[PDB]
Short mmCIF file of N, CA, C and O in Angstrom, two decimals:
data_model
loop_
_atom_site.label_atom_id
_atom_site.label_comp_id
_atom_site.label_asym_id
_atom_site.label_seq_id
_atom_site.Cartn_x
_atom_site.Cartn_y
_atom_site.Cartn_z
N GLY A 1 73.81 -20.38 -116.87
CA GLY A 1 72.76 -20.73 -115.95
C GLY A 1 73.11 -19.40 -115.38
O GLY A 1 72.76 -17.70 -116.36
N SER A 2 72.80 -19.15 -113.28
CA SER A 2 72.51 -18.20 -112.98
C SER A 2 74.41 -17.71 -111.97
O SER A 2 74.19 -17.23 -111.35
N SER A 3 75.17 -17.92 -112.41
CA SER A 3 76.23 -17.32 -112.17
C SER A 3 76.89 -16.08 -111.99
O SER A 3 77.71 -16.17 -113.17
N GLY A 4 76.50 -15.20 -111.74
CA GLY A 4 77.52 -14.26 -111.37
C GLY A 4 75.98 -13.36 -112.88
O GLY A 4 75.73 -13.20 -113.62
N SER A 5 75.54 -12.57 -111.68
CA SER A 5 74.28 -11.12 -112.18
C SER A 5 75.23 -10.77 -113.28
O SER A 5 75.27 -9.85 -113.16
N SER A 6 76.02 -9.59 -111.95
CA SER A 6 76.69 -8.40 -112.04
C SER A 6 78.22 -8.34 -111.18
O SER A 6 78.72 -8.80 -110.36
N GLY A 7 78.70 -7.78 -112.17
CA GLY A 7 80.39 -7.27 -111.68
C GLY A 7 80.70 -5.79 -111.64
O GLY A 7 80.76 -5.19 -111.51
N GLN A 8 82.64 -5.78 -111.97
CA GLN A 8 83.00 -5.47 -112.79
C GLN A 8 81.95 -4.04 -113.78
O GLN A 8 82.48 -2.59 -112.82
N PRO A 9 81.81 -4.88 -115.13
CA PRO A 9 81.24 -4.01 -115.95
C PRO A 9 79.51 -3.83 -115.43
O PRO A 9 79.50 -4.24 -114.18
N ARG A 10 79.14 -3.14 -116.36
CA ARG A 10 77.48 -2.48 -115.94
C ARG A 10 76.20 -3.14 -116.56
O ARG A 10 77.13 -3.31 -118.20
N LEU A 11 75.66 -4.06 -115.88
CA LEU A 11 74.35 -4.65 -116.50
C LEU A 11 73.12 -4.00 -116.99
O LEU A 11 72.83 -3.13 -116.45
N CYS A 12 73.43 -4.17 -118.50
CA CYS A 12 71.62 -2.80 -119.07
C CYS A 12 71.14 -3.45 -119.92
O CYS A 12 71.11 -4.33 -120.56
N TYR A 13 70.05 -3.69 -118.79
CA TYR A 13 69.06 -4.87 -118.71
C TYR A 13 67.62 -3.97 -119.65
O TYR A 13 67.58 -3.07 -119.06
N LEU A 14 67.23 -4.38 -121.32
CA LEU A 14 66.83 -4.10 -122.01
C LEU A 14 65.72 -4.61 -122.00
O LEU A 14 65.64 -5.46 -121.98
N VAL A 15 64.19 -3.78 -122.27
CA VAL A 15 63.02 -4.19 -121.95
C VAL A 15 62.29 -3.55 -123.44
O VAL A 15 62.08 -2.37 -123.80
N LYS A 16 62.06 -4.16 -124.40
CA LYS A 16 61.14 -3.18 -125.55
C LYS A 16 59.53 -2.25 -125.22
O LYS A 16 59.19 -3.20 -124.40
N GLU A 17 60.28 -1.53 -126.34
CA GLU A 17 58.73 -0.46 -125.79
C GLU A 17 58.24 -0.21 -126.41
O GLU A 17 57.42 -0.90 -126.73
N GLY A 18 59.09 0.81 -128.01
CA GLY A 18 58.90 0.86 -128.65
C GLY A 18 58.98 0.34 -130.31
O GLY A 18 60.90 0.88 -129.94
N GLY A 19 58.86 0.15 -131.04
CA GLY A 19 58.71 -0.15 -132.17
C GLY A 19 60.73 -1.23 -132.05
O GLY A 19 60.50 -2.49 -131.77
N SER A 20 61.56 -0.51 -132.11
CA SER A 20 63.25 -1.19 -132.05
C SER A 20 63.48 -0.18 -130.80
O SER A 20 63.22 0.31 -130.33
N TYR A 21 64.91 -0.72 -130.19
CA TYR A 21 64.72 -0.47 -129.11
C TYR A 21 65.68 0.53 -128.82
O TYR A 21 65.91 1.21 -130.46
N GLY A 22 66.11 1.45 -128.06
CA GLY A 22 66.86 2.52 -128.07
C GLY A 22 68.16 2.38 -128.47
O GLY A 22 69.38 3.46 -127.79
N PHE A 23 68.66 1.70 -129.40
CA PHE A 23 70.04 1.11 -129.21
C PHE A 23 70.54 0.72 -131.33
O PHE A 23 69.77 -0.08 -131.50
N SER A 24 71.54 0.99 -131.13
CA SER A 24 71.93 0.48 -132.88
C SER A 24 72.67 -0.03 -132.93
O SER A 24 74.39 0.32 -132.28
N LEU A 25 73.26 -1.65 -133.77
CA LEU A 25 74.80 -2.07 -133.73
C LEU A 25 74.97 -1.83 -135.08
O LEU A 25 75.04 -1.83 -135.35
N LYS A 26 76.77 -1.97 -134.96
CA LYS A 26 77.56 -2.26 -136.33
C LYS A 26 79.03 -2.47 -136.39
O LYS A 26 79.29 -2.67 -134.86
N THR A 27 79.37 -3.74 -138.54
CA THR A 27 80.18 -3.82 -137.77
C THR A 27 81.80 -2.28 -138.13
O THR A 27 81.47 -2.52 -139.17
N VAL A 28 82.47 -2.88 -137.48
CA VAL A 28 83.42 -2.33 -137.89
C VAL A 28 84.37 -2.61 -138.33
O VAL A 28 84.76 -3.88 -137.98
N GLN A 29 85.88 -2.57 -139.77
CA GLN A 29 86.33 -3.57 -140.22
C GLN A 29 87.41 -2.91 -139.76
O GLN A 29 87.90 -1.97 -138.50
N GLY A 30 87.95 -3.69 -139.43
CA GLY A 30 89.20 -4.58 -138.92
C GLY A 30 89.28 -5.14 -136.92
O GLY A 30 89.79 -5.49 -136.09
N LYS A 31 88.55 -4.57 -136.71
CA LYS A 31 87.20 -4.35 -134.64
C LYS A 31 86.69 -5.34 -135.17
O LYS A 31 85.44 -5.78 -136.19
N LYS A 32 87.11 -6.92 -134.01
CA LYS A 32 86.04 -8.19 -133.92
C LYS A 32 85.27 -7.79 -132.37
O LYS A 32 85.47 -7.43 -131.28
N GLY A 33 84.75 -8.11 -133.16
CA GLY A 33 82.77 -8.28 -131.76
C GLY A 33 81.15 -6.46 -132.61
O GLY A 33 82.16 -5.68 -132.30
N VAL A 34 80.57 -6.86 -132.28
CA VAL A 34 79.82 -5.64 -132.28
C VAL A 34 79.42 -4.46 -130.60
O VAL A 34 79.86 -5.42 -129.36
N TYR A 35 78.60 -3.01 -130.57
CA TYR A 35 78.59 -2.61 -129.88
C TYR A 35 77.68 -1.57 -130.06
O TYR A 35 76.83 -1.34 -131.21
N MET A 36 77.64 -0.53 -129.15
CA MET A 36 76.65 0.64 -129.38
C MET A 36 77.44 1.42 -129.72
O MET A 36 78.65 1.31 -129.35
N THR A 37 76.45 1.56 -130.77
CA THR A 37 76.85 3.35 -131.80
C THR A 37 76.31 4.48 -131.46
O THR A 37 76.63 5.78 -131.64
N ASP A 38 74.58 4.06 -131.79
CA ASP A 38 73.84 5.11 -132.12
C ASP A 38 72.25 5.05 -129.85
O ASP A 38 71.75 4.40 -131.14
N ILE A 39 72.55 6.20 -129.43
CA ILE A 39 72.16 5.97 -128.37
C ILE A 39 70.57 6.67 -128.53
O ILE A 39 71.06 7.66 -127.70
N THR A 40 69.83 6.25 -129.36
CA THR A 40 68.32 7.23 -128.88
C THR A 40 68.36 7.72 -127.76
O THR A 40 68.00 7.26 -126.81
N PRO A 41 67.80 9.31 -127.79
CA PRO A 41 67.26 9.68 -126.49
C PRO A 41 66.51 9.45 -125.76
O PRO A 41 65.39 9.17 -126.42
N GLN A 42 66.82 10.07 -124.29
CA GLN A 42 65.12 9.17 -123.40
C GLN A 42 64.80 7.81 -123.94
O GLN A 42 62.73 8.35 -124.20
N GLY A 43 65.76 6.45 -124.87
CA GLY A 43 64.60 6.17 -125.36
C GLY A 43 64.59 4.57 -124.06
O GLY A 43 65.18 4.36 -123.13
N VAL A 44 64.80 3.42 -124.49
CA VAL A 44 64.85 2.43 -124.12
C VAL A 44 66.54 1.79 -123.80
O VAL A 44 66.61 1.16 -122.64
N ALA A 45 66.98 2.13 -124.61
CA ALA A 45 68.45 2.38 -124.59
C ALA A 45 69.17 3.00 -123.42
O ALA A 45 69.20 2.85 -122.00
N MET A 46 69.02 4.62 -123.44
CA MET A 46 69.36 5.81 -122.55
C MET A 46 68.52 5.31 -121.28
O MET A 46 68.87 5.55 -120.25
N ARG A 47 67.60 4.49 -121.17
CA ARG A 47 66.93 4.29 -120.66
C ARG A 47 67.11 3.82 -119.60
O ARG A 47 67.61 4.04 -117.63
N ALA A 48 67.72 1.83 -119.85
CA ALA A 48 68.65 1.71 -119.70
C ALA A 48 70.04 1.13 -118.63
O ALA A 48 70.85 0.88 -117.51
N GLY A 49 70.17 3.29 -118.75
CA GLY A 49 71.69 3.20 -118.70
C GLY A 49 72.36 2.88 -119.33
O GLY A 49 74.27 2.49 -118.94
N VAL A 50 72.61 2.50 -120.41
CA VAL A 50 73.55 1.85 -121.08
C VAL A 50 74.34 2.52 -122.71
O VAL A 50 73.59 2.91 -123.65
N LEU A 51 75.70 2.57 -122.31
CA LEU A 51 76.12 3.83 -122.73
C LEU A 51 77.13 3.71 -124.49
O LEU A 51 76.62 2.80 -124.71
N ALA A 52 77.27 4.64 -125.36
CA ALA A 52 77.54 4.35 -126.98
C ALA A 52 79.49 3.38 -126.75
O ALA A 52 80.07 3.39 -125.57
N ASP A 53 79.56 3.30 -128.26
CA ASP A 53 81.05 2.88 -128.41
C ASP A 53 81.36 1.55 -126.74
O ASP A 53 82.73 1.77 -126.07
N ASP A 54 80.22 0.93 -126.64
CA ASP A 54 80.84 0.19 -125.62
C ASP A 54 80.82 -1.89 -126.31
O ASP A 54 79.70 -1.77 -126.49
N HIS A 55 81.99 -1.92 -125.84
CA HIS A 55 82.27 -3.44 -126.15
C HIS A 55 81.00 -4.07 -125.08
O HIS A 55 81.46 -4.83 -124.22
N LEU A 56 80.57 -4.71 -125.93
CA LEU A 56 79.66 -6.17 -126.18
C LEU A 56 80.07 -7.08 -125.23
O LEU A 56 81.42 -7.18 -126.08
N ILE A 57 80.18 -7.19 -124.54
CA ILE A 57 80.31 -9.05 -123.31
C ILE A 57 79.85 -9.97 -123.49
O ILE A 57 80.19 -11.07 -123.80
N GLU A 58 78.42 -9.36 -123.98
CA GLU A 58 77.51 -10.83 -123.60
C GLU A 58 75.93 -10.31 -123.93
O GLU A 58 76.00 -9.59 -123.40
N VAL A 59 75.36 -10.91 -124.79
CA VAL A 59 73.90 -11.01 -124.48
C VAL A 59 72.58 -12.54 -124.23
O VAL A 59 73.19 -13.22 -124.01
N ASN A 60 72.12 -11.36 -123.00
CA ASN A 60 70.65 -12.80 -122.21
C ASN A 60 71.65 -13.28 -122.15
O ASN A 60 71.00 -14.31 -121.96
N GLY A 61 72.83 -13.79 -120.91
CA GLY A 61 74.27 -14.38 -121.30
C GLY A 61 74.55 -15.17 -122.35
O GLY A 61 74.84 -16.37 -121.85
N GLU A 62 74.78 -14.44 -122.73
CA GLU A 62 75.24 -16.05 -124.04
C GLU A 62 76.43 -14.71 -124.74
O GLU A 62 76.37 -13.62 -125.73
N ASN A 63 78.37 -14.55 -123.99
CA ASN A 63 78.89 -14.31 -124.62
C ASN A 63 79.14 -13.97 -125.85
O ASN A 63 78.96 -14.38 -126.77
N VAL A 64 79.26 -12.99 -126.77
CA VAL A 64 79.53 -12.23 -127.74
C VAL A 64 80.61 -11.22 -128.02
O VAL A 64 80.93 -10.88 -129.09
N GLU A 65 81.78 -11.62 -126.96
CA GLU A 65 82.44 -10.92 -127.77
C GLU A 65 82.97 -10.27 -128.78
O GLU A 65 83.33 -9.67 -129.34
N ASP A 66 82.93 -12.18 -129.38
CA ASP A 66 83.65 -12.02 -130.56
C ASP A 66 82.22 -13.20 -131.26
O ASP A 66 83.03 -14.04 -131.96
N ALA A 67 81.78 -12.16 -131.22
CA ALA A 67 80.19 -12.77 -132.12
C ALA A 67 79.70 -11.97 -132.92
O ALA A 67 79.49 -10.02 -132.78
N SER A 68 79.63 -12.65 -133.93
CA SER A 68 78.90 -11.69 -136.20
C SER A 68 77.97 -10.88 -135.21
O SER A 68 77.15 -11.66 -134.81
N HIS A 69 77.73 -9.92 -135.90
CA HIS A 69 76.38 -8.71 -135.99
C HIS A 69 75.01 -9.87 -136.27
O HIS A 69 74.74 -9.90 -135.33
N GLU A 70 75.33 -10.40 -137.11
CA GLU A 70 73.85 -11.62 -136.91
C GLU A 70 74.02 -12.94 -136.85
O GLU A 70 72.60 -12.56 -135.93
N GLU A 71 74.74 -12.71 -135.38
CA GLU A 71 75.18 -14.04 -134.06
C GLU A 71 73.51 -13.37 -133.75
O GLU A 71 72.91 -13.45 -132.35
N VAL A 72 74.16 -12.13 -133.18
CA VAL A 72 73.83 -10.89 -131.64
C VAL A 72 71.74 -10.70 -132.56
O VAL A 72 70.59 -11.22 -132.06
N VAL A 73 72.63 -9.73 -133.58
CA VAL A 73 70.78 -9.56 -133.96
C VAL A 73 69.87 -10.56 -133.93
O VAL A 73 68.11 -10.28 -133.96
N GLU A 74 69.86 -11.85 -134.53
CA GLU A 74 69.05 -12.81 -133.86
C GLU A 74 69.42 -13.46 -132.93
O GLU A 74 68.18 -13.70 -132.10
N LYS A 75 70.16 -13.39 -132.19
CA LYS A 75 70.22 -13.45 -130.18
C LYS A 75 69.25 -12.32 -129.64
O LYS A 75 68.31 -13.04 -128.91
N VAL A 76 69.30 -11.40 -130.20
CA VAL A 76 68.21 -10.47 -129.95
C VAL A 76 67.06 -10.20 -130.14
O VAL A 76 66.26 -10.40 -128.99
N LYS A 77 66.45 -11.43 -130.96
CA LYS A 77 65.14 -10.85 -132.24
C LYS A 77 64.74 -12.18 -131.39
O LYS A 77 63.76 -12.50 -130.86
N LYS A 78 65.17 -12.96 -131.13
CA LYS A 78 65.54 -15.04 -130.43
C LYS A 78 64.85 -13.94 -129.52
O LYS A 78 63.93 -15.11 -128.83
N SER A 79 65.29 -13.96 -128.67
CA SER A 79 65.48 -13.93 -126.73
C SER A 79 64.16 -13.35 -127.24
O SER A 79 64.29 -14.42 -125.55
N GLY A 80 63.12 -13.57 -127.33
CA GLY A 80 62.16 -12.47 -126.82
C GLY A 80 61.37 -10.89 -126.81
O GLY A 80 61.02 -11.16 -127.31
N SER A 81 61.44 -10.85 -125.97
CA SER A 81 60.92 -8.91 -125.63
C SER A 81 62.03 -8.68 -124.90
O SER A 81 61.77 -7.38 -125.39
N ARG A 82 62.13 -8.76 -124.06
CA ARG A 82 64.00 -9.24 -123.09
C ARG A 82 65.58 -8.98 -123.19
O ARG A 82 65.17 -10.34 -123.89
N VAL A 83 66.57 -8.36 -122.96
CA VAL A 83 67.80 -9.04 -123.26
C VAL A 83 68.36 -8.38 -122.42
O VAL A 83 67.83 -7.35 -121.91
N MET A 84 69.46 -8.80 -121.98
CA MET A 84 69.75 -8.27 -120.80
C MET A 84 71.95 -7.84 -121.19
O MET A 84 72.66 -9.43 -121.70
N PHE A 85 71.99 -6.64 -121.96
CA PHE A 85 73.32 -6.71 -122.42
C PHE A 85 74.30 -6.45 -121.24
O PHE A 85 74.15 -5.36 -120.23
N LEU A 86 75.21 -6.28 -121.82
CA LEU A 86 76.61 -6.61 -120.22
C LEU A 86 77.92 -5.81 -121.48
O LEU A 86 79.22 -6.17 -122.41
N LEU A 87 77.85 -4.18 -121.36
CA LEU A 87 79.31 -3.60 -122.30
C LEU A 87 80.10 -2.81 -120.73
O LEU A 87 79.24 -2.57 -119.76
N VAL A 88 81.55 -2.31 -120.89
CA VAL A 88 82.14 -1.45 -120.10
C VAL A 88 82.43 -0.38 -120.68
O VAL A 88 81.74 0.25 -121.92
N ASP A 89 82.40 1.20 -120.16
CA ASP A 89 82.29 2.23 -119.84
C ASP A 89 83.15 2.26 -121.07
O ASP A 89 84.89 2.25 -120.85
N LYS A 90 82.65 3.37 -121.88
CA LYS A 90 83.77 4.42 -123.08
C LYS A 90 85.37 4.89 -122.30
O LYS A 90 86.39 4.37 -123.03
N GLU A 91 85.24 4.45 -121.07
CA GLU A 91 85.78 5.30 -120.48
C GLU A 91 87.17 4.51 -119.90
O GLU A 91 88.25 4.75 -119.83
N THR A 92 86.41 3.92 -119.50
CA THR A 92 87.53 2.49 -118.32
C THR A 92 87.60 1.81 -119.47
O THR A 92 88.72 2.11 -119.02
N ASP A 93 87.74 1.02 -120.25
CA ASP A 93 87.96 0.06 -121.56
C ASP A 93 89.25 1.15 -122.07
O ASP A 93 89.43 2.97 -121.74
N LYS A 94 89.43 0.51 -123.64
CA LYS A 94 90.49 0.92 -123.54
C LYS A 94 90.75 1.24 -124.89
O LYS A 94 90.64 -0.54 -125.44
N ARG A 95 91.16 1.34 -126.35
CA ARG A 95 90.58 1.71 -127.75
C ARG A 95 92.57 2.07 -127.97
O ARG A 95 93.61 2.92 -127.43
N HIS A 96 93.07 2.05 -129.58
CA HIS A 96 93.94 2.68 -130.14
C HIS A 96 94.39 4.06 -129.98
O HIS A 96 93.18 4.96 -130.67
N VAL A 97 95.01 4.65 -129.24
CA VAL A 97 94.96 6.36 -128.85
C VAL A 97 96.09 6.63 -129.73
O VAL A 97 97.62 5.94 -128.95
N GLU A 98 95.96 7.18 -131.09
CA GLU A 98 97.27 8.00 -131.59
C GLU A 98 96.72 8.59 -132.02
O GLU A 98 95.83 9.07 -132.61
N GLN A 99 98.30 9.71 -132.40
CA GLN A 99 98.16 10.78 -133.46
C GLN A 99 96.27 10.66 -134.00
O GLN A 99 97.44 10.37 -136.02
N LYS A 100 95.12 11.02 -134.02
CA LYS A 100 94.18 10.88 -135.57
C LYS A 100 95.02 11.51 -136.07
O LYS A 100 95.81 12.65 -137.03
N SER A 101 94.35 11.14 -137.55
CA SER A 101 94.95 12.08 -138.46
C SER A 101 93.32 12.85 -139.89
O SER A 101 92.35 12.19 -139.49
N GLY A 102 93.74 14.20 -139.68
CA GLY A 102 92.43 14.45 -140.69
C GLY A 102 92.31 14.44 -142.23
O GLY A 102 92.66 13.63 -143.15
N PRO A 103 92.18 15.31 -142.78
CA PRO A 103 91.37 15.15 -144.30
C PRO A 103 92.85 15.64 -144.55
O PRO A 103 93.68 16.72 -144.23
N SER A 104 93.45 15.48 -145.40
CA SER A 104 94.14 15.45 -146.02
C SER A 104 93.58 15.78 -147.97
O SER A 104 93.04 14.78 -148.31
N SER A 105 94.14 17.08 -148.37
CA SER A 105 94.65 18.00 -150.24
C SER A 105 95.41 17.84 -150.48
O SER A 105 95.99 18.27 -150.00
N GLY A 106 96.08 17.59 -151.63
CA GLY A 106 96.90 17.77 -152.76
C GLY A 106 97.18 16.60 -153.90
O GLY A 106 97.24 16.28 -154.53
#
């Protein structure tokens, strides 16, 4: 329904403008759920105020936290022309922070 519009996280209301939105979704191995990776500049996304590496919480009012890419990509196209994306900032959230590894040779 309409219980709760905005709260802790930021509401990113996307509005179809040119061909495809200004964001891109991708599935990462090991991780559960989809999120924004490519945020086109001065585009539909960058305009809505949606940052990258933001774990999806719900689309058009449909929790996608543990939703498969297929479920989302389909919910977005079906949604119609506009959609409501809700995610958290990359800084606010917390990811697996550890001594990253570089290139190995030998």
